CSV table of C-alpha atoms and ligand atoms in Angstrom, one decimal:
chain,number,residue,atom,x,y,z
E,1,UNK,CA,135.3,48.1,20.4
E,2,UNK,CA,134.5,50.4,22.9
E,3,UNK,CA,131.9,48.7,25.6
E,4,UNK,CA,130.2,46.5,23.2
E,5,UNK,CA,129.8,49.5,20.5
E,6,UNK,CA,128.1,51.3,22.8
E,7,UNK,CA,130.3,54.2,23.7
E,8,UNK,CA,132.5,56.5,21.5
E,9,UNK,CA,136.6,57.4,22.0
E,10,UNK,CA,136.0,59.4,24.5
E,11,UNK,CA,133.4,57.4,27.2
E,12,UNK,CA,130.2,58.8,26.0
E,13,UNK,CA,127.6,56.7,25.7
E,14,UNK,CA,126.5,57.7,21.6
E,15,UNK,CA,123.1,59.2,22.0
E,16,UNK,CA,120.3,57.8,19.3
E,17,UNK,CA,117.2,59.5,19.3
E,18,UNK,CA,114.1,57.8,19.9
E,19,UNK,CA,116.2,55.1,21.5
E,20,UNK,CA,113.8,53.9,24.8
E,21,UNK,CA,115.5,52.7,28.1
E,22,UNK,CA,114.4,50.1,30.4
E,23,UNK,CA,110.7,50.4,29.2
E,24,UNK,CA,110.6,53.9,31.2
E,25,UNK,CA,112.5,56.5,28.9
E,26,UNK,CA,112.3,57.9,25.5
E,27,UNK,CA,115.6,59.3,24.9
E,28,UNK,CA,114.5,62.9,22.7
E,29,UNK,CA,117.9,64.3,21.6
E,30,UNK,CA,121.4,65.2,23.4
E,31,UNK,CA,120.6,68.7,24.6
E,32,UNK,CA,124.0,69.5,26.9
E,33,UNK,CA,127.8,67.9,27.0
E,34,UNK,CA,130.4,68.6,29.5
E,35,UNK,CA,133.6,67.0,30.7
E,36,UNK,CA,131.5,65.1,32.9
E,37,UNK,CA,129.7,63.0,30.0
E,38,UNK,CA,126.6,63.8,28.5
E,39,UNK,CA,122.5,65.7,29.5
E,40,UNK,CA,119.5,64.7,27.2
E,41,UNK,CA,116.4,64.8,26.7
E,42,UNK,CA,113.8,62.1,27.5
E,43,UNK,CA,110.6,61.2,28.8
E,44,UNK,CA,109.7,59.3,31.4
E,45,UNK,CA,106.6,57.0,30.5
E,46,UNK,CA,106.2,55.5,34.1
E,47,UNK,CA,105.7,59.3,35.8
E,48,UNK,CA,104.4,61.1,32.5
E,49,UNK,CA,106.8,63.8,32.7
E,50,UNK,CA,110.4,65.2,30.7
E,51,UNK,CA,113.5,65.0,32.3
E,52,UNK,CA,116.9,65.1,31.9
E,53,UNK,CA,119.4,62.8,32.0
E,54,UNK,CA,122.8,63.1,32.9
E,55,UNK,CA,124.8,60.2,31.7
E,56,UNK,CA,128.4,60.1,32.8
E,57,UNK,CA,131.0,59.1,30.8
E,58,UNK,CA,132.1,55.3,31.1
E,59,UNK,CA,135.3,55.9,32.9
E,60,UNK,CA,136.4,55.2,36.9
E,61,UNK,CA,137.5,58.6,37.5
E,62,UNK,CA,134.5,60.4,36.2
E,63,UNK,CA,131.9,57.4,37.7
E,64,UNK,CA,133.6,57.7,41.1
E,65,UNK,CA,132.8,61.9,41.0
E,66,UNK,CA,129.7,61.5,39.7
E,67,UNK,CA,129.1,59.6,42.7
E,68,UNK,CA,129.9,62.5,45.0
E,69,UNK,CA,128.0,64.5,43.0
E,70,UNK,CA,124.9,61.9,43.9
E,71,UNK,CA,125.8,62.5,47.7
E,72,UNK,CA,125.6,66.3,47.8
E,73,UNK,CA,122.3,66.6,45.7
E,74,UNK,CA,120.9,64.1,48.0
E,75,UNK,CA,121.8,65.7,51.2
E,76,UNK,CA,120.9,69.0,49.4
E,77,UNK,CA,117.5,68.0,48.0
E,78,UNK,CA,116.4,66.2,51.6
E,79,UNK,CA,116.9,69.3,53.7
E,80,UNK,CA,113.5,70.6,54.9
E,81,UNK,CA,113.9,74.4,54.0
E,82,UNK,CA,112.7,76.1,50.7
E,83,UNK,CA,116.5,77.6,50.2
E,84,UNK,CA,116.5,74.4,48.4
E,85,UNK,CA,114.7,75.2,45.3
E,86,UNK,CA,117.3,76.7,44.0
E,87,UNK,CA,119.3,73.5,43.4
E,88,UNK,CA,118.3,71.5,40.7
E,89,UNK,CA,116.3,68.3,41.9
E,90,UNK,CA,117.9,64.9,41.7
E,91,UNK,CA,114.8,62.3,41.1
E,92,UNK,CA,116.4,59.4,40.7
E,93,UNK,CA,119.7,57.6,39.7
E,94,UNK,CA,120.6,54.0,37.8
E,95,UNK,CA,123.4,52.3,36.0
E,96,UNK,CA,122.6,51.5,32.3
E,97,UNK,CA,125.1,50.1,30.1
E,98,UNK,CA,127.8,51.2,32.4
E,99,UNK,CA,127.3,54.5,32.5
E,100,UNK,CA,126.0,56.4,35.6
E,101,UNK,CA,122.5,58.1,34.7
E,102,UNK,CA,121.1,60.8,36.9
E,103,UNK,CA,117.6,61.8,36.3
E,104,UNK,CA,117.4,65.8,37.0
E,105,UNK,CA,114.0,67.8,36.6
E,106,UNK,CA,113.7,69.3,32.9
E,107,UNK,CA,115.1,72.8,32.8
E,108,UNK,CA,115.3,76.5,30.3
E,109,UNK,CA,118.0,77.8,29.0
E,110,UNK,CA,121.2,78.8,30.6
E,111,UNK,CA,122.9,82.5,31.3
E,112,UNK,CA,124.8,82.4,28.4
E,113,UNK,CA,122.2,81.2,26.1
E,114,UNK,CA,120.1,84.6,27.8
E,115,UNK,CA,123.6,86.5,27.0
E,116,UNK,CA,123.9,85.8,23.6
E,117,UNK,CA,120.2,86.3,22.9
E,118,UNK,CA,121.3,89.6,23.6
E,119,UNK,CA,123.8,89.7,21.3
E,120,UNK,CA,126.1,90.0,24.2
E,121,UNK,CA,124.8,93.2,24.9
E,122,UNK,CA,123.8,92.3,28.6
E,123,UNK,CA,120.7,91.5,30.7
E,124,UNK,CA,119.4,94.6,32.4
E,125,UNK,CA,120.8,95.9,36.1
E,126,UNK,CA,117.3,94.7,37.4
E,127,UNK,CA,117.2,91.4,36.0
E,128,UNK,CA,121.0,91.5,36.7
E,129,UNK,CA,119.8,91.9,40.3
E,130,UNK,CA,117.1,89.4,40.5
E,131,UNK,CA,120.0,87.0,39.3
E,132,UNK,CA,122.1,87.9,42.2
E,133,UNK,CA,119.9,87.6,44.7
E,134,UNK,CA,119.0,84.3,44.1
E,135,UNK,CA,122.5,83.4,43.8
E,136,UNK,CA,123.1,84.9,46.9
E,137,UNK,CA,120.2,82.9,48.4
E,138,UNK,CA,121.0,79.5,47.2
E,139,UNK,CA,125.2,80.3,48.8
E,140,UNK,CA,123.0,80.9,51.6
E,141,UNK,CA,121.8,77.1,51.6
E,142,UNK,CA,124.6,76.1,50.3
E,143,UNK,CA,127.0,77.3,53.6
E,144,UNK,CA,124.7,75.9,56.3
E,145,UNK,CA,126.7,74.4,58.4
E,146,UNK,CA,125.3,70.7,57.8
E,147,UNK,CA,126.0,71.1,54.2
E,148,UNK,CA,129.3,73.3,53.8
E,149,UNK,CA,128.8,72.7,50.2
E,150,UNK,CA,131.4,74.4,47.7
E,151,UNK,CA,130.0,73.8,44.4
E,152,UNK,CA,133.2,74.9,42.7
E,153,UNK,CA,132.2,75.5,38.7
E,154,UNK,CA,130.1,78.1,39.1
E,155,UNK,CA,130.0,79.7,35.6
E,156,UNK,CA,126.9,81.2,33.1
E,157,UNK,CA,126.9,77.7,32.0
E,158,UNK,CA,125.7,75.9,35.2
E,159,UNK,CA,122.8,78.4,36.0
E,160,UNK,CA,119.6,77.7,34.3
E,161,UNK,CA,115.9,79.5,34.1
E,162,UNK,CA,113.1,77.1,34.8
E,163,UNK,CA,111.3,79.0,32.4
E,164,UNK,CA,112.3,80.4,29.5
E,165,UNK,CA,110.0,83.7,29.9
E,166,UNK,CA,110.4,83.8,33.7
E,167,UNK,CA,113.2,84.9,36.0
E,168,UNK,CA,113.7,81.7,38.2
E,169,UNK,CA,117.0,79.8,38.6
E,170,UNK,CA,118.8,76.7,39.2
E,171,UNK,CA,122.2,75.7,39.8
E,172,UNK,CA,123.3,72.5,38.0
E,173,UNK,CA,126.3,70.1,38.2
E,174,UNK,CA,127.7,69.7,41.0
E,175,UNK,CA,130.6,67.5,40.0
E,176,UNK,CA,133.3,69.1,40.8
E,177,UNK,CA,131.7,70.2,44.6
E,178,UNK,CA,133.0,69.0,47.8
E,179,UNK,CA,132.3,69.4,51.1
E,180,UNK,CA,134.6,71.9,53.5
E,181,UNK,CA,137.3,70.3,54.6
E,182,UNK,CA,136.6,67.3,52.5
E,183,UNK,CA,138.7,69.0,48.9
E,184,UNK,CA,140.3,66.7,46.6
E,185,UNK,CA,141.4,69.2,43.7
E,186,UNK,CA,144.0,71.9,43.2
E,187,UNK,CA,142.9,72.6,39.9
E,188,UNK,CA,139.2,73.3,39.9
E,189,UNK,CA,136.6,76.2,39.0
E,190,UNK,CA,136.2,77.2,35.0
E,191,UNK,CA,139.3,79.3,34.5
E,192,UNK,CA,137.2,83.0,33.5
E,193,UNK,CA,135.5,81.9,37.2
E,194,UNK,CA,138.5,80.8,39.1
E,195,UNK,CA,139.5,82.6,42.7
E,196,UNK,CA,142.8,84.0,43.3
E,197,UNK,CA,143.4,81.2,46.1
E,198,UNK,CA,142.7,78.5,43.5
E,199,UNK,CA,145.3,80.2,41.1
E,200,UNK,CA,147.7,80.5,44.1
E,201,UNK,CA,147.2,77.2,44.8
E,202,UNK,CA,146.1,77.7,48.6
E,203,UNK,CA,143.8,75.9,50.5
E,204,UNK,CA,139.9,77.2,49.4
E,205,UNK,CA,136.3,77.2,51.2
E,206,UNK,CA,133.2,78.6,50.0
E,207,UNK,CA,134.1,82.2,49.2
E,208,UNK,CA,135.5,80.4,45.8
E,209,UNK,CA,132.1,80.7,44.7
E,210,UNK,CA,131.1,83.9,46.2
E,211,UNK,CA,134.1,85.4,43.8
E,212,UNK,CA,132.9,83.0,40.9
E,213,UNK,CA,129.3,84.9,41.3
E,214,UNK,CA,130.8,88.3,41.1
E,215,UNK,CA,132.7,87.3,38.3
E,216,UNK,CA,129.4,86.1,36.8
E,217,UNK,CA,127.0,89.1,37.8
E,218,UNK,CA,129.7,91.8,35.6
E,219,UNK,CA,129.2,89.7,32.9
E,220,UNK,CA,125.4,89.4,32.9
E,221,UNK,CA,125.1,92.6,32.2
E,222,UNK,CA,128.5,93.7,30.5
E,223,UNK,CA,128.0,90.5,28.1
E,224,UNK,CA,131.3,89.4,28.3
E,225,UNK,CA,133.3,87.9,31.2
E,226,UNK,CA,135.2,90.6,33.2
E,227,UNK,CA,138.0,88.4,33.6
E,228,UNK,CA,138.9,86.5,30.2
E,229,UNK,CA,142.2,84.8,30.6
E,230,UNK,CA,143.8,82.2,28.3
E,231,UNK,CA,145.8,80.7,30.9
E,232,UNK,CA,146.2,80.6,34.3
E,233,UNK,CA,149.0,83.8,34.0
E,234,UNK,CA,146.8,85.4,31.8
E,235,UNK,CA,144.0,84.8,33.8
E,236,UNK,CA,145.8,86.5,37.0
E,237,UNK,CA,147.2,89.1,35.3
E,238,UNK,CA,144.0,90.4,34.1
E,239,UNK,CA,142.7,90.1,38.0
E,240,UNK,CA,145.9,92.5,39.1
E,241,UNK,CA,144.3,95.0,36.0
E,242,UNK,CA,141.5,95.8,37.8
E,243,UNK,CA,141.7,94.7,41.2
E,244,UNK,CA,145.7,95.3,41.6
E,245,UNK,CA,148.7,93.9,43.1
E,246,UNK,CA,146.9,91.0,45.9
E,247,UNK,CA,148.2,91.7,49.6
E,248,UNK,CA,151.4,90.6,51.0
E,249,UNK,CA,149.6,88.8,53.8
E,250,UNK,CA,148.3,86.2,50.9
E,251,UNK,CA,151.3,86.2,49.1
E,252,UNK,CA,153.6,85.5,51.4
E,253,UNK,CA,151.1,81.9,52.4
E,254,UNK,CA,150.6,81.4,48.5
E,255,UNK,CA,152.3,78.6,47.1
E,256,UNK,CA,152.4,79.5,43.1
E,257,UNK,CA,153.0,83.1,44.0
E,258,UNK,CA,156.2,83.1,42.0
E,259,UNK,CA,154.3,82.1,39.1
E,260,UNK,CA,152.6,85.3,39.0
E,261,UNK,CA,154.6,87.6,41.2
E,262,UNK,CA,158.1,88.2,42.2
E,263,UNK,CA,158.9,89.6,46.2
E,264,UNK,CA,161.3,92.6,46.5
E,265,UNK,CA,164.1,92.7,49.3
E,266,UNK,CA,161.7,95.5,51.3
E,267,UNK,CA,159.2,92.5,51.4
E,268,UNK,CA,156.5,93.6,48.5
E,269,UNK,CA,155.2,92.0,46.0
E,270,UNK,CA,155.0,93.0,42.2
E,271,UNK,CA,154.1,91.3,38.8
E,272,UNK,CA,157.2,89.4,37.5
E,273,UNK,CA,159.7,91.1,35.0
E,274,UNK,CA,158.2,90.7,31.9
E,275,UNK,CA,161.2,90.0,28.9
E,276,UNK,CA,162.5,92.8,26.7
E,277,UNK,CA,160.4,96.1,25.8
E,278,UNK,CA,157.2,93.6,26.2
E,279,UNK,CA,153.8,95.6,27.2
E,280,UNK,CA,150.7,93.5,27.6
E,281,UNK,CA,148.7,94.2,30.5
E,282,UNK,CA,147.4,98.0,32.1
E,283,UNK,CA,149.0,99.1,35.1
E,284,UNK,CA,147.9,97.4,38.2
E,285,UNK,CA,144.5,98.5,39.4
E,286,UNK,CA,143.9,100.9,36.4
E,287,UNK,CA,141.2,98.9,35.3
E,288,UNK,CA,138.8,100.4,36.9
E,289,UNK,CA,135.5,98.7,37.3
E,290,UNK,CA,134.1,101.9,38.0
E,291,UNK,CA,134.4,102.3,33.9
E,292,UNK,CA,133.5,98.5,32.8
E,293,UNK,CA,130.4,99.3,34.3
E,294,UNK,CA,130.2,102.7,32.9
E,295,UNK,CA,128.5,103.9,36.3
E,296,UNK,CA,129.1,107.5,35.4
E,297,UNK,CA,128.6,107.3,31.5
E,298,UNK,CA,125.3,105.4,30.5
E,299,UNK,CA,126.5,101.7,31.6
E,300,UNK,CA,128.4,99.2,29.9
E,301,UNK,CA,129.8,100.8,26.5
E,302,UNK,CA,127.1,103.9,26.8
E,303,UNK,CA,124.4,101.3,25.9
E,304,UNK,CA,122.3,102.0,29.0
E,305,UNK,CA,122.0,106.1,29.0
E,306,UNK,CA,119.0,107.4,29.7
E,307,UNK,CA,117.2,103.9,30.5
E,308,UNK,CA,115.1,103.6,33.9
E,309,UNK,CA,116.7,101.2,36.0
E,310,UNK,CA,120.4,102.1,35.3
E,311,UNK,CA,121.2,105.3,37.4
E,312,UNK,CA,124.0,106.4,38.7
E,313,UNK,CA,122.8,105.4,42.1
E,314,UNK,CA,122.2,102.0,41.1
E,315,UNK,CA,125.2,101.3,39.5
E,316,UNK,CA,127.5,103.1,42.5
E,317,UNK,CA,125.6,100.3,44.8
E,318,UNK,CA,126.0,97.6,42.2
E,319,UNK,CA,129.6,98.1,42.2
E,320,UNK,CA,130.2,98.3,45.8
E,321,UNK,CA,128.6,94.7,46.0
E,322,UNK,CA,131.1,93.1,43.5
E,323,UNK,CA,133.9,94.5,45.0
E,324,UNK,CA,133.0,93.7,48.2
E,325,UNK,CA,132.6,90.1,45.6
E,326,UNK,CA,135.8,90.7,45.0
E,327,UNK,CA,138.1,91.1,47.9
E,328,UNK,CA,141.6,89.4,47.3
E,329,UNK,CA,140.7,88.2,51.3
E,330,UNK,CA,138.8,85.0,51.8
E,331,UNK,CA,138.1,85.8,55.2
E,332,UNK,CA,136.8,89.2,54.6
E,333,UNK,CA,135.1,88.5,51.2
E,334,UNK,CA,131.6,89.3,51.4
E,335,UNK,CA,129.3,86.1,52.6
E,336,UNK,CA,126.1,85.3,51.6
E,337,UNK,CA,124.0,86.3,54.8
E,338,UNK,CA,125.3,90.2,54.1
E,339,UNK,CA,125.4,90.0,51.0
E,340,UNK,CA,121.6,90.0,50.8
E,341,UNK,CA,121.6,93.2,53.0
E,342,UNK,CA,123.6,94.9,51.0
E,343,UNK,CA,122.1,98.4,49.6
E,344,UNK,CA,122.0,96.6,45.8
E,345,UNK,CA,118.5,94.4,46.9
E,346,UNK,CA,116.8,97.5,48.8
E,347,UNK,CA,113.3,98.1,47.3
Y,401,YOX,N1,125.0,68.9,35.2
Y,401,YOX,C1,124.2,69.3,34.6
Y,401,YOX,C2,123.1,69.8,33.7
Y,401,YOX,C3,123.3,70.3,32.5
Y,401,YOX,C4,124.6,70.5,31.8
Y,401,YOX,C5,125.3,71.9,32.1
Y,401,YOX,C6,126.5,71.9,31.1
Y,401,YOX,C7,126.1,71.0,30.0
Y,401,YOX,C8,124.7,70.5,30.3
Y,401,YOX,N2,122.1,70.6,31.9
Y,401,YOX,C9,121.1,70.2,32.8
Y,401,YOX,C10,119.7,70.2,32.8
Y,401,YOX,I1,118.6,71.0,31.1
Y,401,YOX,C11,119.0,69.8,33.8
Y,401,YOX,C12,119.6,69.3,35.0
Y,401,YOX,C13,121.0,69.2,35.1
Y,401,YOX,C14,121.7,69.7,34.0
């Protein structure tokens, strides 16, 4: 009953293996889902090559974003610079049995995937910083002027390894992106990810994903996310635990600020009351990141002591960077161009 038997309850389009589409593709197996629809596997006879499909899910509001998404990759993928190579190709895009299907390059495994290989006990500082520098790179490309992109999900998720064995990256899914200027969401970046302007509800630009990277580099090598809240108070009160009380000058422009905070008559800002003898959450700021990172005592939990690669040094530079990451400040944040020439990527 849902188009023609087709789809299931929730839009997808239900994925048979070995099913072959418009005498071109061999769909394998469903390798990926997301809110967005659905990625698999398939091969394209006509070009002799795997691929991946992204097939949105059968439904206005997530067609009509899927075709923004189409717009950026396409402006993205046509500029003549090799900045570009760090966004996942769009090859081609066509409507089959209503659904939006975007062909994408095949790619590796994702960060997480690399994480939990691990067994969450974190990538090394140098592969750590061989992630961030691409990152860095690709916001690069992404904040040319021409583009202004804000890809706005970045998470361990949406960063893949061409190669399974190699270092190389690719940012995927841009389908909750926009264009400066051009925003359409209040709610938006994956909550572990998501800036303190996008949990004050104030107007955003591309730092949002210079924090969301900073987020993600602690956690590459920590294993897990440095920020793991279970709602959007939870998620800000764990930001205040290491980073502390945000500034009055955002506050007082913030529009949810009294769902975090609470303004005293001498005009600053602290948590709100919490009810009865209720203790949840360290003091504001004594979460040091100085310790997550164990920068003094072998890395994160002791596991790094004695390793080359993980001095003191290394970490004291590494830590600077995420901070600078960090900044409660949009407008002083750290951007991409500096970020590159920070200490952290000196041979
Ligand atoms: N958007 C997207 C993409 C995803 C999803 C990320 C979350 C679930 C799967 N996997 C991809 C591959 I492999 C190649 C190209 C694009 C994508």
């Amino acid at each position: 009953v849902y188009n023609d038997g087709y789809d299931d309850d929730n839009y997808d389009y239900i994925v048979k293996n070995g099913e072959k589409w418009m005498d071109r593709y061999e769909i394998d197996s469903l390798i990926g889902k997301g809110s967005f629809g659905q990625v698999v596997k398939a091969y394209d006879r006509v070009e002799q090559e795997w691929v991946a499909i992204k097939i949105i899910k059968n439904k206005k509001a997530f067609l009509n974003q899927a075709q923004i998404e189409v717009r950026l990759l396409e402006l993205m993928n046509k500029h003549d610079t090799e900045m570009k190579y760090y966004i996942v190709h769009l090859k081609r895009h066509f409507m089959f049995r209503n659904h939006l299907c975007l062909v994408f390059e095949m790619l590796s495994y994702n960060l997480y995937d690399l994480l939990r290989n691990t067994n969450f006990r974190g990538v090394s500082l140098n592969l750590t910083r061989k992630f961030a520098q691409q990152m860095c790179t690709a916001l690069l490309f992404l904040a040319t002027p021409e583009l202004s992109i804000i890809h706005c999900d970045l998470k361990p998720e949406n960063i893949l390894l061409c190669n399974p064995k190699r270092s190389a990256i690719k940012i995927v899914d841009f389908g909750s992106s926009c264009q400066l200027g051009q925003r359409i969401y209040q709610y938006i970046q994956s909550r572990f990810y998501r800036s303190p302007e996008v949990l004050l509800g104030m107007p955003y630009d591309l730092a949002i994903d210079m924090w969301s990277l900073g987020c993600i580099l602690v956690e590459m090598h920590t294993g897990e996310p440095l920020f793991s809240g279970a709602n959007e108070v939870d998620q800000m009160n764990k930001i205040v635990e290491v980073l502390g009380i945000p500034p009055a000058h955002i506050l007082d422009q913030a529009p949810k600020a009294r769902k975090f905070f609470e303004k005293l008559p001498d005009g600053t800002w602290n948590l709100k009351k919490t009810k009865d003898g209720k203790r949840e959450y360290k003091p504001p700021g004594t979460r040091k990141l100085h310790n997550i990172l164990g920068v003094e005592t072998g890395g994160p939990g002791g596991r790094r002591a004695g390793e080359s690669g993980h001095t003191v040094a290394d970490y004291l530079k590494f830590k600077d960077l995420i901070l600078r990451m960090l900044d409660y400040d949009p407008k002083t944040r750290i951007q991409p161009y500096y970020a590159l020439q920070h200490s952290f990527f000196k041979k």
